């Protein structure tokens, strides 16, 4: 139950706003920076303020505050839902979220403002659906938004029909510094990129574990996935029922289902760091990087980000394999690997200089994180098994998907 | 090509479960 | 400079002219409007705004803005005086009551020095009932001789036959252009 | 540039009509009192071209508390606009209806709620919706002499589940202040 959806600067500006119910004065956006600023130097900063009995609450943009003002008991979590669709949209439609658009796209953001939410109760989201009755460049709306089906414009028509697949996983480490790993997650998501002609009803099916279990059989590799959060378009009840995954994609690239479940199994990459650091003389990095990951599977671009010390100069590299750069900007040694074969070992052995003088505040132990990411490799052993692709008209669909592991939490404890 | 594997072509369905 | 695009655009036509449409309420106005533009009885509530449209007739753009005659709505005829070059008087000969009324309103927005060039535009509307009076009488009444300065011609139009209004459409082009 | 801008936005051109009221959405964005012009602009309100009515609207109503006197001057134009064929004329018409935060206006504004309440456009009656609520919020026993809860009940028992939920929300928020 938002007030006043507004759109902040990061000087104070408010580059728009857009006022929904009138019961907050237009006057309270002036104490919102004063309270950041108090908030934020006393270590209390929220991004939900309280200015009397107005709360502020916004999420911070790359360059704005998206702050929504409100009043009563409204729901936060309605708010914040809000605003990361307002985000996207912004995204969708403006390929750069900075202040070059804001002042530059007024005659369609008013527009999109007030279509997308009245009274503070958002009625339309979706972007591709979005984009046929507002423009920057009007007919009836079309029927979509009345249709049940708010997510695939009807009369859609391609000359091939490509729906390209995208399992991208997400690996995340939490290793202490005594040498275990503590959070050890791993977040799937099946993003698509559909492009078919009609309004094609799709019956994703995988090897899921509950699956094979209803079927019986539960004896070859079934991803346990914990959590399985499918889109909109997904329909909860036919999952529920009997894991059937029937939904009709949209028109473009999006999040179909996101799996999220534990892995109790090593990791691809054992990071094996020492440092030697005499006290305001010198420091050694020894640090050895084992790929526990199968020796078939390349991870691209390998980057292990190692935190050096902020005030290190003078810095030697004598390493293996890939190139060693310390960035001041970071400040940590980024151990930048083009390609790493499974079960290699880089051996790295780093040496920097210290001032004689010590310095007036810690500085803290940023944790090591490497920026591995391995192309055709499912570390769940999740693997897609078909997808009924079912037109009213009739055609023969191409379907295609490919698999990468990247990293998603894969930091390591320092010492 | 293209970097993060090779896109492979889907099935339709659990062809041996009917 | 040269005006020859003016002479060649004048070769067909170029003059639009605009027009007003005051009054007192519920006397027809709003009728005789639409019949203007479509040409058909419109039914339509009490102007609570205003109207503005516009005819096409003769080679000549005859905008018309249509005002209502509400109590709360006869100051807000100063706000149509900028950039105003016609004006056409509504009188209702059916309501006796109101006569004093919209002869002291027309008095009043006649007695302004912006709207000078606007020549007077009486038309006798409701011409349907037995004790509507002629051309001479209503005029008499209103006095519109001692209008000095001030170019006025009574005109009778039928709301439910839409007689009469090409007469004073025909006279208010006659004085708004003077060319053959 | 004040006197400039109205006489551009009192012209017969919709070329120089457009970019006025650009400049106009401009400058109070960037921060201006453009208040003083509330009466200047309402005149060039009623245009066929529908990127222009929309800014029109969203200065009424950023300008209808500040003004109220001067916000006489749109009922009739809001009564015109929720008949147009086009639904999303209609809906603006109707979002922009309940912004006005007008004690003297929201009385006239029931015929029109009441006409686009069992509207058969989806868009309309989703629209209609969240206007009922506004309008109970600013006037909470004008929604009862009106008999819009009796309209809004049935809303829920009708197809279209956007508009549905819709009404929904209208009616928890309705309960919520009750
Ligand atoms: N019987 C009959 N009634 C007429 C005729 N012409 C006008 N009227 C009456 O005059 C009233 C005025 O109608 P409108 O023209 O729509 O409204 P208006 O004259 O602009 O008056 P306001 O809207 O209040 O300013 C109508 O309700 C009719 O009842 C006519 O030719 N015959
Ligand atoms: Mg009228």
Partial sequence: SASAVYVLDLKGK???????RGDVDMSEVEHFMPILMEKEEEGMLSPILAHGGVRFMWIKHNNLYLVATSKKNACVSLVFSFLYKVVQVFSEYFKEL????????????????????????????????????????????????????????????????????????????????????????????????????????????????????????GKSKSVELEDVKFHQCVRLSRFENDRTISFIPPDGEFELMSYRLNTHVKPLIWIESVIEKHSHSRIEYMVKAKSQ??????????????PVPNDADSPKFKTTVGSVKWVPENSEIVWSVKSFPGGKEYLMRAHFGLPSVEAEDKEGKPPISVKFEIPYFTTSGIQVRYLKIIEKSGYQALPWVRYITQNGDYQLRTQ | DRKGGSYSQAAGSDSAQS | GNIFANLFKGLFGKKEMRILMVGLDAAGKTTILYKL??????????????????????????????????????????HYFQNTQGLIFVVDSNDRERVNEAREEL?????????????????????????????????????????????????????????????????????????? | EIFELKAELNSDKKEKKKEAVKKVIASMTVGKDVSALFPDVVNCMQTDNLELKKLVYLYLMNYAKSQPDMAIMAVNTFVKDCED?????????????????????????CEPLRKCLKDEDPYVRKTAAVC??????????????????????????????????????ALSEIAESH
């Avoid at chain 1, 990951?293 to 190692?306: D, L, P």
């Avoid at chain 3, 040409?39 to 007739?57: A, H, L, M, R, W």
């Avoid at chain 3, 001692?146 to 009778?156: E, K, T």
């Fill in chain 1, 14 to 20: 408010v580059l728009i706003c857009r006022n929904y």
């Fill in chain 1, 98 to 217: 900075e202040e070059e658009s804001i002042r530059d796209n007024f005659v369609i953001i008013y527009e999109l403002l007030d279509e997308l939410m009245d009274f503070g109760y958002p009625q339309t989201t979706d972007s591709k659906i979005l984009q046929e009755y507002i423009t920057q460049e009007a007919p009836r709306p079309p029927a979509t938004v009345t249709n049940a089906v708010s997510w695939r414009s009807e009369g859609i028509k391609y000359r091939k029909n490509e729906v390209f697949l995208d399992v991208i996983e997400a690996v995340n480490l939490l290793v202490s510094a005594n040498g275990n790993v503590l959070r050890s997650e791993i977040v799937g998501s099946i993003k698509m990129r559909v492009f078919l002609s009609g309004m094609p009803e799709l019956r994703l099916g995988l090897n899921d574990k509950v699956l094979f279990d209803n079927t019986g059989r």
């Fill in chain 1, 293 to 306: 990951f199968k020796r078939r599977s390349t991870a691209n671009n390998v980057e292990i980000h190692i």
């Fill in chain 3, 37 to 78: 533009k479509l040409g058909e009885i419109v039914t339509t509530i009490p102007t609570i705004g205003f109207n503005v449209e516009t005819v096409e007739y003769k080679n000549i753009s005859f905008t018309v803005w249509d005002v209502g005659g509400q109590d709360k709505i006869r100051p807000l005829w100063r």
């Fill in chain 3, 107 to 180: 008095m009043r927005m006649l007695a302004e020095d912006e709207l000078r060039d606007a020549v007077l535009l009486v038309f006798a509307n409701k011409q349907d009932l037995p004790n509507a009076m002629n051309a001479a009488e209503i005029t008499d009444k209103l006095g519109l001789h001692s209008l000095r300065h001030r170019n006025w011609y009574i005109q009778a139009t039928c709301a439910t036959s839409g007689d009469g209004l090409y007469e004073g459409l025909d006279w208010l082009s006659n004085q708004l252009r003077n060319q053959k």
């Fill in chain 4, 85 to 109: 064929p086009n639904p999303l004329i209609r809906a603006l018409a109707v979002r922009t209806m309940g912004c006005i935060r007008v004690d003297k206006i929201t009385e006239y504004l």
């Fill in chain 4, 132 to 169: 009922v609520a506004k309008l109970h919020d600013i006037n909470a026993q004008l929604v009862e002499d009106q008999g819009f809860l009796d309209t809004l009940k049935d809303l829920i028992s009708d197809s279209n589940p956007m508009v549905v939920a819709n009404a929904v929300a």
